[PDB]
Design a protein around this ligand. Sequence first.
Ligand SMILES: [Ca+2]
Lengths: 659, 503
Amino acid sequence: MEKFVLFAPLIASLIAGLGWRAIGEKAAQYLTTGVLFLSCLISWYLFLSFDGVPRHIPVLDWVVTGDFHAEWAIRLDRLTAIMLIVVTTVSALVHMYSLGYMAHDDNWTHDEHYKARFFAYLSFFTFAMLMLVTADNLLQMFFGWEGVGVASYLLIGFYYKKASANAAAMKAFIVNRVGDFGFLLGIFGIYWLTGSVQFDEIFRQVPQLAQTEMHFLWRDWNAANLLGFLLFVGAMGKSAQLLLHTWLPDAMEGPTPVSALIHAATMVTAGVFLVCRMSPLYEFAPDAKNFIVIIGATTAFFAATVGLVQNDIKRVIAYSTCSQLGYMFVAAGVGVYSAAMFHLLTHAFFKAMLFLGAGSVIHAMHHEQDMRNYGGLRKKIPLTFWAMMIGTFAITGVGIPLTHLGFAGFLSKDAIIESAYAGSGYAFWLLVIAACFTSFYSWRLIFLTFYGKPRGDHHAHDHAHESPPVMTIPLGVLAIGAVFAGMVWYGPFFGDHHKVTEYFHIIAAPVGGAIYMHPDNHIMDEAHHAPAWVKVSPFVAMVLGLITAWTFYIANPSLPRRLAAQQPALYRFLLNKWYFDEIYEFIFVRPAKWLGRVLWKGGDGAVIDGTINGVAMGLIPRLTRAAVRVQSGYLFHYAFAMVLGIVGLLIWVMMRGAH
Amino acid sequence: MTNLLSIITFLPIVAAIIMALFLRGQDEAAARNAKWLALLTTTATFVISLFVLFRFDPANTGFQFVEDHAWIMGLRYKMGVDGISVLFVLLTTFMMPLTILSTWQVQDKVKEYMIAFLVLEGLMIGVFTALDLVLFYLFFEAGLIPMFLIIGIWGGKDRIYASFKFFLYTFLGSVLMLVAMIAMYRMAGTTDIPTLLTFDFPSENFRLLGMTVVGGMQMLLFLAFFASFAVKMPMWPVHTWLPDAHVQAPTAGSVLLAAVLLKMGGYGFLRFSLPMFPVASGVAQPYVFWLSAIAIVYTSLVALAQSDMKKVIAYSSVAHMGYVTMGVFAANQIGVDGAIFQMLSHGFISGALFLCVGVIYDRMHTREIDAYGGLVNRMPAYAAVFMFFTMANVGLPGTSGFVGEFLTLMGVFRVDTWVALVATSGVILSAAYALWLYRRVTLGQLIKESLKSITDMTPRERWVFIPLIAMTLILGVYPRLVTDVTGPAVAALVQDYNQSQPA
Ligand SMILES: [Ca+2]
């Protein structure tokens, strides 16, 4: 039953991807879309019927060599069941949404066929993420890890005739490879310290790992801290965390349905999930968690400021995902992994809707993506307006301040902000400030597109119309999650310590549970006991950013233009996204190309070949010319040589003496 | 069925002699006969070598299928296989039928082309079956002759220089190994490889010229063999023959040059350097580690700078062999198993990539990257195949490329973390040059009149690739098909290496 969920999407993708010609494009699209829905139902049944006893379903042996063994296997615990409904639900919806969004594409000429290929890529992308989240060992986690990398590269560069898409997909693969470099070094370290790559066997040995010193490069390190850091470098790349983030903004070059799947279900959630799946190790690594928070909190702030000034609709939502994933890393760092998963689960719902909502706008607006040309549109697109509004409500966290009643992201974000206060003063303050910036760019997105004077070319504006039901029903189903999901799962994830324990079926060896929390950790409790000025600050900052957005676009709409002129250097800094790309091109790309040409022409050509050719073709021919010259043809010279030979040999015999 | 190794070794050579004698005519029908005769011969050799593969017993770490006869000058003709060398026989016989099938459109001196490949196969197989020290050297060096002519007659515009550099560079390194083989022959009084595997060559230090020779006689013998296998592998910096020979050879020549002949250097390390000179190998481990780490980084950056598509693939091979060298000299079960897997895996992937170059070389007669672009628009099947092997070339999990890379890196980590960190960066660098080459050649718009009418892969071309895609995926998903065979033999090899280390 679990195997069907895992392997059905792969089989559908193979049939649709390679054999759509035999069975036609339409049968291929329905095969992938239909098979996803069936797995989504099986995922929900697995999720709502889980009794709390993790299951281990073996499939095949992958790599066996001496004492090293990793297997194709399926583990089903609370974490796996959670990720199942998140992956399959959003993937199933994205397949349905794609049936209309890609119905007639302007990127391709009518000769070219793309519909069957696109749906095969989505099914395989689903397969890779499913393989990642059901992993029983660190190696299979890597396969899915690299699997989403190649599926994303296929989909981010779906429009292979667009040089911008081909560069963007290439960038995503390379940057995520930089993350996989640390991941791999963590896997090597774990195997040699514990003799296994299986999660349970690793967790059993974690307490000794915390007291272990491991040599690595120039010094010895606490094993747990080093390994936690090395595995986190992988999570930073996959979740587009700070310093490994530049690939996510450019993933917009792909189709809009791909952005939703990357940003809410498959790619970015992998990093947080790894942190939560590997919590039995991060609980015994005090210093690794410290670094997770600083990265997590700085990313939330960094990605919030950049979203303030971006003008492309998807790139605003692109940075929102990075900032939102900042929050979930703070929660795991402070030691509350249920809250990290809680926000991950709720984030999947309203983030998918926001992207599927923005696809409708782009689809309706004749595929224009610059918000500067998006005025009005509220009456022209009724349902997309409200779905986007609900998405804004959830991400901003519109609720009743001191109660436990509101949209999805209201509850989950408050849990993280409460935990941040108990866990790190650095974390708590950056998050609320980011929470203030979140409200501005979220509502700035609404006012620019769904309000004001119809702004930009009237042709599309007049022709604007609501997209067909196939693109709106998935939005509707998502809305049923971006309102009730937070209230539905608050208790089991964050509400009561006993409630959280049984849900996750959690010094004793940190094994048997979906997550682990060290006994000395009480941040979850201290979050509940936190004062009231903590529990209301998110509502205050959210409102505060809202009023600025209202003040900046409805009333006195010239304030946004004037302020940049007052502080212009700070306008460029945000607009250029803090210049990270330019720094990398200077420090990594250009030097690497220059280094290769120097080694190619200077090393191989001038030093190594220059020497070899210099001897083979310079020296030996020079000795040949001397030999030819000495063969003068004069008889008296040849006799001289014979006499020199005898005289030299006689000198040799004389030095040895009579004896 | 008692001389199976002799049959698979000399059957291709005998067929070449028959073809040279009893095949007449230079018209297309005469050429058409030569291609069919070669294809049936290579297919026959592969089928017979499957009997070896399936009768082979992995649990037995001794030599199987052994045949021994008297020979000249007091030597013996002895052949056999074990878990370390059986798979290199099957790889050779597997690539040969596919390589023949890819030459089906060659019209220039076809009968002579087929003879050179048939002779080359027999000599390549002998390298892996020989169990006599001199017999190994005979097949090891005899292979230079047909390859010298394959590059010279059918190569590119620089083939005269490439063929001479290939022969003389390789010849220079192996003559030093010949003198070491004569010395081992005199010390042990035998050329029997099984007997030399248990002999203890002296390792007590002595002084030679102005330096101490750490490792004594073993180090001197080790260095002679290292010179031969380092150039053959090739290792950095003795690699600069490969970007000439592999590039200037005909496509079929490049396939066998990269898929098979490179493996003779790595197999040499597993057959001789580690078993017969363990003390010297332990001493040389630090230097081999950094030469191999340098090779991965150095040639990965050099590949990124190439303007010539075939040269990118050529330089890629040198990086991939860097993993093999590290894995061998990590001298633990994980590293050595990864090294053998990496060698076999690189055979399918590198060969396939050289066939991908030939597909578009045949149509356009150029190797400049900038002469292509947007080929996906006219060549959908090619872009899919080229993409698959591009991804295998960057060690993507699920393809056989990942397994060999992963295990050699983890075996080295156990010994040296600095080396493993530098070598592991190849995953970042391999993706860089491999993806950039694929993008610049296959993706984009078709904006050149020359490429406007380009055709897609023909059915024969598609069928050459399908076996290579199968092996890459099968071994990527089920590598146990390889490690079950090599497991027990590597375990015994690793154990002897440990028991010989100085105490
Ligand atoms: Ca031995």
